[PDB]
Amino acid sequence: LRFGEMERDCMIAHGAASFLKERLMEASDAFRVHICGICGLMTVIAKLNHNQFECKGCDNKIDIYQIHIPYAAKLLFQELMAMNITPRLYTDRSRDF
Amino acid sequence: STSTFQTRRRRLKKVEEEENAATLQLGQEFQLKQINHQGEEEELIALNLSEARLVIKEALVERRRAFKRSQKKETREKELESIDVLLEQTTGGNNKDLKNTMQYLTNFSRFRDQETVGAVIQLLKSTGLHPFEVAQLGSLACDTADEAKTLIPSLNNKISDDELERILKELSNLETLY
Amino acid sequence: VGQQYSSAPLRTVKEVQFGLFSPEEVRAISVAKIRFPETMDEQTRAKIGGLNDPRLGSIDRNLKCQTCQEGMNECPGHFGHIDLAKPVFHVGFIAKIKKVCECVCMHCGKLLLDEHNELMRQALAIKDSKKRFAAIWTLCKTKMVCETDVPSEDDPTQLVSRGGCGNTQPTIRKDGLKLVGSWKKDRATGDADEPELRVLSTEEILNIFKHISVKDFTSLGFNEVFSRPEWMILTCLPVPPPPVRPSISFNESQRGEDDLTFKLADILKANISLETLEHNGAPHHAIEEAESLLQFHVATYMDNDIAGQPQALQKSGRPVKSIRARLKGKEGRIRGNLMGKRVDFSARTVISGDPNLELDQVGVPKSIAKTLTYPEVVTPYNIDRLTQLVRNGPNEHPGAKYVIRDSGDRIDLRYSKRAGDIQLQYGWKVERHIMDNDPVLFNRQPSLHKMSMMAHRVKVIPYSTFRLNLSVTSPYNADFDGDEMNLHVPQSEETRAELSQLCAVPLQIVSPQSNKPCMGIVQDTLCGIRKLTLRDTFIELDQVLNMLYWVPDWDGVI
Amino acid sequence: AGRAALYKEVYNVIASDGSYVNYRHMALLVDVMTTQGGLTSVTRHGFNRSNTGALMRCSFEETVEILFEAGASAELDDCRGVSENVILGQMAPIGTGAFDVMIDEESLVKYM
Amino acid sequence: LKEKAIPKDQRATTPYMTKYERARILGTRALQISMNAPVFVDLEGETDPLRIAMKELAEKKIPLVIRRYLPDGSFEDWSVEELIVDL
Amino acid sequence: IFVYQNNITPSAMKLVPSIPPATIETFNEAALVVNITHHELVPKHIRLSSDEKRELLKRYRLKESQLPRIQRADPVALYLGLKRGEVVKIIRKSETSGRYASYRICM
Amino acid sequence: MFFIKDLSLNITLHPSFFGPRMKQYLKTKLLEEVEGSCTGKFGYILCVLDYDNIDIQRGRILPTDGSAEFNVKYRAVVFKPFKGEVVDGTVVSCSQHGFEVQVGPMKVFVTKHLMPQDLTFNAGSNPPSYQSSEDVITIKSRIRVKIEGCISQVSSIHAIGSIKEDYLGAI
Amino acid sequence: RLVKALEDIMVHYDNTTRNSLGNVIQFIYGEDGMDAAHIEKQSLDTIGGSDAAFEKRYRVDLLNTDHTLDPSLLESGSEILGDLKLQVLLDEEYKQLVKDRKFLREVFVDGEANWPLPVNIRRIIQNAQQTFHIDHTKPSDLTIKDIVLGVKDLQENLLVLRGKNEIIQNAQRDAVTLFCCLLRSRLATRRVLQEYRLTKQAFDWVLSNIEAQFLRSVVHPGEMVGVLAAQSIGEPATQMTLNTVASKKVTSGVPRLKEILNVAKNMKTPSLTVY
DNA sequence: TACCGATAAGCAGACGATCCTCTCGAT
DNA sequence: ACTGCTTATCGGTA
RNA sequence: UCGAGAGGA
Ligand SMILES: [Mg+2]
Ligand SMILES: [Mg+2]
Ligand SMILES: [Zn+2]
Ligand SMILES: [Zn+2]
Ligand SMILES: [Zn+2]
């Protein structure tokens, strides 16, 4: 059953952040991807058995992190990548604000 | 997954810097003037083979004191065997690297007794040289000024040939007995 | 999780940086050559090392994927690269490219207006991004020719040098996918009085854009490392792996490829024509007649519903899906998959009213309670409960469908040889059926305000229908005239608490919208309270005691 | 005086049929529309053309258009908004998520 | 920038526990108790972890601290004991 | 301050930005006939000095931009003749609070 | 060479270990992983200095799961070698190709061409030897080597050092 | 459009209404900082009525034979008569009450007294009369210094913003104003004894109960507010039957909202009002 | 007369209740 | 379904 | 699964 926009908006209003996160992830999409700390792109070749985690073009096997994002967001970022747009997923703070 | 201490800034790919060499072109982490857990700008802590030996021994002796606190509620060859026992108490047998390190450190230590090493560090960490050069001079036994300048090429013009010999001759007197 | 443990650390995404792909990095990032435009078969079977799985995203049942294997559900796919025979513009940055062309002057690649102009200094004053460029465009738009010497009143009378070659920049317009320039000159020399017309190819534009100074990026709202104006012209295009454009399983032996798979092949087809046309005997106006087509394919691939004139049909005489149209607003990726999505642990049925139900209570039909599950972790507080439940299986009322071990394994009690057994160790998860007093979210569309989405206490009742208290009719604005309603079962102890501590029906009694309450006594209850509350009627002892007994919290005093 | 007139006009419609919506609600919207300098339209080119993060504005009308301008003008979404967190499938800093909760060793031993 | 925060002295935030704090503290403690965490309050034959989580708040034996973030990034660390439960 | 009766030619408005720090302003007869500030709806606008402004941004933990904004050509802004950076404290009758203090920085 | 590095480590802890003996368990979990571990970035993490006063501060209990993310600020001894660093260790392995020298936890290999021409290998000797005159390199024999190059490899740094230069060779 | 415009908007831990970015929309939510549900439409007795009845019901004059409190109301009613020290405080009381009348009339021009405010004082005194079973026969245990000081001491503890500096302290005083204006209206020394008849026990309880209900009435940092508002205005918009003497034909209903939100160079009915 | 802003005469790119349920036809 | 944004003719400034 | 058409509070 679809938990649309109106459904999301209502849950925001309530303030129930964990339920809204659970319904959008655990109850649906939810995908684990390894991203390059250097770039921010899903260009990491994640070998779980051999541990050859290195991202081709970056040479690093160290600055790599796993992330929990909706599979549709993964597909969104890849669709943007396929359109010469870079949605560099950065795990580090750099502007304070 | 222990990558920390001196982190940032990484702005896309980067050149990688330069190859790690004895021209004091040390790792992008081992800067002459680094940071601290408190926050202050602390100078690089480089230990010689004599310092490092009495540093791990100190930490491990003080480790067993604290490890047995929770349980409630000095001769050449004899140093080898005593440390071997301590390593089995304080740490698990899995840490084979520390066992290889301690065995090496105690057999290659230029200064055994704490008292002498204190004076070695007061003599070296005053010369106005890079901490790595100090850690190398106190580790490697040198008779000639040229011997030191060849083994530690970071020196050359950094120190006077005659003045370096004064230090090298002083170390020979400071030398412990095995 | 995307299944299985990883020695890599999990971290929250703090910020997302945007930019443009450098054709240099796309070539580095790539794992595929993409020489062949054929999808499946060697030609034999299992997809050739050209288009689809050369060293990227796997296909049906095989894990393969660039030695890393992992399998479909874990394989995020791995981008490839297609080297474009001749550089081409990116649909999105068409007007932007034209506006930068009208800004920075050609033949030298330097700004039309410099710091010497008082208005340029006033324009460069804002440290914005696009609003700075808005002023930079309008100023550089006119003043047609490039300069060398310009200041006369900040310096005595003589003008001092600041720029390069003073060539005339032309007026640029859009002839569909391409842009053309109109040079002036004509002052008592050549072309009488009519202007000179030239076709401005990407190759020309790209060279001028490559010679654009580092400080000319920052003035025009461009990045030194993320958005270089050159990257607006594609020289190398990234090829998305199969999770983006899935092949689909059409029986044992067939195909059924994605629209994007056919479109990428259509680009390769047009690229391979030019690949040979440029190499072999070049017939001048024959390369352009196929270059404008490669420009067209690479354009409709990203945006098919393009401005006024062009249109692409896939055959049959119906168009092709574009990446822009794929993630376009209103039930398309952004609005249809991310801001709202279909969810597991949910139910829907026709709703009915009840006087014997509690305000915050909900009537759940058995055929819903038996179908929906809550993962209850094994602790000393339950065990015997969860054990008795496991024994009831997926058919009895308390029951349970699956049992999760210490390791990642589901025990489907419907099947399983150990179904009757199971010792039930601690920390294990038990996917038990919804029981009474279980806090569950209830909702009625359109969900217009804070409520109409309230946490309800479960009461498992017979008959396939959602039972509700009549007094909570108003927040949902729902009559029982064939009205259907949704339900959502929380899977965590935290998310189920987030409902019982904030979203509870009794908690949401007073409306913060109007400052008054949102629930009241309606219909029979309201009609009857008038007929009851009056001096006229009194109730005798026989009916008076039943009246008193019906009140659940009665003091027992007559 | 423009916001005072805006509120009067906004309220007068709520007052026109079926009273009423609490001051705070309209006073919020009115202040949103005016605490910008002038009047801010509740449209695709009104409020949506703001200083806000790319992913937040892309979720309302101008999508691929905003995503392209985000890449072209090298925008950096701060990930402080509701919409960006929903897209990232992370706990939004809304109500329950507006703070972090830790465990204290000093406290833990104290209670035993 | 360089290690912010506000001391446990001089704090402009409400001494009372926000309804969102209660919901999170109760929810998380219940989740932890559900995930076999050691219980600090003397159990009264409670089978439900949220009933226990609520009991944990009554005696104020929860070892949880709330990092209330200010819009500028600076934070005030409030221990569940300090926070008064009116609501 | 300079008061005109009809129209100042844009050329007589070109030498106006010259001569700092002297602030020269233009006002039409018809614009000044009736006082705009005296109107029922318009609240009290109070200018704040560099000493006053710095205290507001420090205590309210604001970073200049985050503060609500006021137009430079605004009738009340030209009435107090303030420049970019100057903040005004707006005191208005509140039908819920009694009175509410607002803040607006000039553009 | 042996450096003192005051680096940290993030450790995620399960809610079942939220008992009074947590600090002791978290301090142990730090030694369990970090102590003995070797990385290209920092080198061989030999010994975590001072068991007392290890900063544990506060561990944020994660969003949807009850686990706590504790950042463990510590200080330890590291063995990170360099290409040009002169180190004297003990020969362990010896064959026709060359000999491996155990310098601390790291093994440094010396090729037949990286040592003097006027040396040569002697197979007809137990243990295998490298003779010349009165200088013989066997199963023990302490030597001084100049690291010509460094190799990262897994969680164990290795090196290809030389002994054919002035003031080097056997010691 | 409303809900998307006000997503980011939320009440912060510094009692301010900001958004995602961090820009201030409101310095105090709804200018008073009260959780909309804890509010009831209460009538201000100071603004409404004649100047004669206002002086009659609120003015206490110990230096008068007819305008003083009868010793049947106060325990120390005869020994309070003609006191210079105590009448100074009762002059101080009435001078703030006369300022309240002038200030309230400035805000609420049309004269309307019934305004939505927190803490139902109307019920809190009703509750006290039953909770303590107070009789009209016997006089109060309270003194003038107990009432007037106790009311002003309560006003100090009615916190919205926690301060230290001039701005937050003035923001706190501004945030209350209207509420403590009603508090002076209802807890006036004369009204306390003439109408309510409260003892020292019941009065000290009511002061604590008002304090408690007020601190409960404050906004919770985390309240969505924006989404709440957006849904709260968009919700009645759905049930707008009539889409437009007053004039004959103006623009109201759903199509007016179109104009107000679009912003808005449309004619339709641009009819202005001249006084 | 070399310039400089006026008010038109034109064109364009993206939108418009939330959920739900069913049936028929390929090129 | 709305009010907008991008561009041809034209009086007057010095 | 795509596209049309139908149907509901
Ligand atoms: Mg941004
Ligand atoms: Mg209906
Ligand atoms: Zn990378
Ligand atoms: Zn893969
Ligand atoms: Zn030029």
Side-chain angles (χ1 to χ4, degrees), chain G residues 1-152:
Chain G
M1 173 263 251
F2 284 75
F3 306 113
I4 279 172
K5 205 74 158 164
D6 50 311
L7 69 153
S8 66
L9 166 70
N10 280 260
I11 302 165
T12 313
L13 183 82
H14 185 276
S16 66
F17 313 115
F18 294 5
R21 297 227 161 268
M22 189 180 75
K23 204 206 280 296
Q24 191 236 24
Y25 179 60
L26 265 151
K27 275 182 182 185
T28 305
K29 199 79 190 169
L30 173 78
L31 319 164
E32 277 176 75
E33 288 164 17
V34 144
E35 205 178 72
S37 185
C38 175
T39 185
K41 213 164 171 176
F42 299 91
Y44 291 89
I45 296 91
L46 315 154
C47 174
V48 187
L49 312 164
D50 50 67
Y51 190 86
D52 303 76
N53 297 323
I54 300 171
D55 221 305
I56 195 81
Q57 47 207 330
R58 271 151 181 176
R60 64 121 166 181
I61 58 124
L62 297 180
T64 194
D65 65 302
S67 304
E69 192 165 48
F70 272 101
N71 180 66
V72 198
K73 297 198 283 172
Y74 69 98
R75 189 181 285 264
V77 283
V78 282
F79 190 92
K80 210 262 195 282
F82 303 102
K83 314 168 185 183
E85 178 187 302
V86 181
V87 282
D88 46 350
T90 321
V91 181
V92 183
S93 309
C94 178
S95 188
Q96 51 142 297
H97 300 308
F99 58 89
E100 284 176 84
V101 183
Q102 191 73 30
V103 179
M106 158 187 78
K107 220 160 183 183
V108 181
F109 179 73
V110 191
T111 90
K112 164 65 210 148
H113 321 90
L114 253 63
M115 66 177 96
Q117 320 96 322
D118 47 290
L119 213 87
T120 73
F121 177 71
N122 195 261
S125 184
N126 296 328
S129 58
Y130 271 98
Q131 311 161 135
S132 183
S133 35
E134 43 249 276
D135 55 307
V136 176
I137 295 114
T138 49
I139 201 154
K140 283 206 195 82
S141 45
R142 47 169 63 202
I143 195 137
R144 185 170 277 149
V145 199
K146 180 247 178 175
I147 303 157
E148 212 69 47
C150 275
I151 312 102
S152 299

Side-chain angles (χ1 to χ4, degrees), chain B residues 1-14 18-111 113-178:
Chain B
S1 298
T2 194
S3 300
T4 23
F5 180 73
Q6 267 189 303
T7 46
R8 292 93 157 235
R9 296 144 164 256
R10 55 182 205 264
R11 297 297 212 274
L12 248 164
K13 293 132 180 287
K14 294 277 179 74
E18 212 181 81
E19 196 190 289
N20 299 7
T23 61
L24 296 164
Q25 187 58 254
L26 265 68
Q28 303 297 325
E29 206 76 38
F30 308 102
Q31 258 80 263
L32 53 100
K33 278 191 97 73
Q34 53 181 35
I35 59 115
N36 206 319
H37 268 314
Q38 295 108 64
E40 67 145 300
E41 193 184 63
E42 191 187 50
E43 198 208 284
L44 170 67
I45 324 102
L47 315 157
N48 57 330
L49 256 63
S50 54
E51 222 177 328
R53 190 195 80 107
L54 296 159
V55 152
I56 305 159
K57 207 252 186 182
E58 244 184 281
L60 290 174
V61 158
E62 260 291 285
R63 174 173 288 191
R64 204 189 74 258
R65 297 265 139 90
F67 253 76
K68 304 303 117 72
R69 254 189 288 266
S70 59
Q71 284 274 94
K72 229 179 179 172
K73 284 144 230 288
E74 258 192 80
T75 51
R76 191 190 82 253
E77 231 290 298
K78 287 193 257 169
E79 191 81 90
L80 265 295
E81 54 211 58
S82 61
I83 283 161
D84 204 285
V85 175
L86 172 77
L87 290 164
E88 264 106 69
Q89 297 170 276
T90 55
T91 321
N94 50 273
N95 196 345
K96 64 156 194 176
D97 296 305
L98 187 64
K99 199 173 186 174
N100 298 314
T101 307
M102 285 308 284
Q103 199 179 82
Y104 167 84
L105 278 165
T106 197
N107 274 88
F108 285 86
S109 191
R110 280 190 78 187
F111 318 96
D113 299 287
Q114 173 70 71
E115 304 86 62
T116 59
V117 213
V120 171
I121 268 78
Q122 275 186 71
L123 171 79
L124 288 165
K125 297 177 189 288
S126 57
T127 58
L129 294 160
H130 191 276
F132 177 75
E133 295 180 284
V134 161
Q136 278 281 91
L137 277 155
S139 161
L140 303 154
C142 301
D143 300 77
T144 1
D146 189 29
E147 181 161 39
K149 304 275 204 78
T150 306
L151 301 169
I152 305 134
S154 323
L155 302 156
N156 303 331
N157 60 323
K158 279 200 171 205
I159 185 151
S160 307
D161 291 75
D162 288 64
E163 227 297 310
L164 178 77
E165 192 57 43
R166 286 190 222 259
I167 305 145
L168 295 159
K169 281 173 174 177
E170 191 90 40
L171 268 335
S172 298
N173 306 3
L174 277 144
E175 277 273 300
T176 201
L177 295 144
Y178 267 47

Side-chain angles (χ1 to χ4, degrees), chain F residues 15-83:
Chain F
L15 80 147
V16 160
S18 187
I19 303 158
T23 317
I24 172 156
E25 291 168 64
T26 59
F27 294 95
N28 192 306
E29 182 216 345
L32 310 155
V33 170
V34 159
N35 198 0
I36 50 99
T37 57
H38 280 9
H39 193 279
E40 192 184 54
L41 272 83
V42 208
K44 242 179 275 128
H45 295 73
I46 293 94
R47 205 211 290 112
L48 302 158
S49 63
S50 288
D51 322 282
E52 291 175 284
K53 182 188 172 180
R54 278 183 284 102
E55 179 67 3
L56 174 73
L57 309 158
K58 173 205 172 181
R59 302 296 182 152
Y60 268 105
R61 280 154 159 161
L62 293 168
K63 52 186 73 66
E64 204 217 53
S65 59
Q66 290 184 322
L67 210 135
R69 307 192 285 105
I70 189 163
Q71 274 282 83
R72 191 192 262 269
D74 207 55
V76 280
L78 300 163
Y79 191 88
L80 270 76
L82 92 172
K83 219 220 174 184

Side-chain angles (χ1 to χ4, degrees), chain D residues 51-54 57 75-78:
Chain D
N51 330 75
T52 330
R57 305 168 298 113
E75 271 141 64
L76 167 59
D77 187 280
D78 333 65

Side-chain angles (χ1 to χ4, degrees), chain C residues 97-170:
Chain C
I97 276 171
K98 182 201 118 213
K99 289 183 189 200
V100 175
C101 272
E102 289 164 327
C103 274
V104 164
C105 192
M106 320 290 206
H107 314 117
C108 70
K110 208 225 174 174
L111 293 157
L112 203 152
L113 266 89
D114 259 52
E115 286 77 20
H116 303 72
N117 181 269
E118 227 287 279
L119 233 157
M120 193 60 170
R121 203 272 301 155
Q122 287 244 67
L124 271 142
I126 319 155
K127 307 281 113 74
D128 202 274
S129 185
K130 188 80 182 179
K131 296 297 147 188
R132 175 183 58 247
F133 172 75
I136 304 301
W137 184 60
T138 48
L139 264 68
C140 297
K141 191 168 70 197
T142 49
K143 268 108 166 175
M144 300 319 288
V145 69
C146 182
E147 297 86 357
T148 173
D149 303 60
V150 273
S152 190
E153 203 46 62
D154 52 273
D155 300 306
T157 311
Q158 56 211 311
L159 285 77
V160 288
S161 193
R162 55 111 254 193
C165 58
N167 200 285
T168 314
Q169 175 197 265

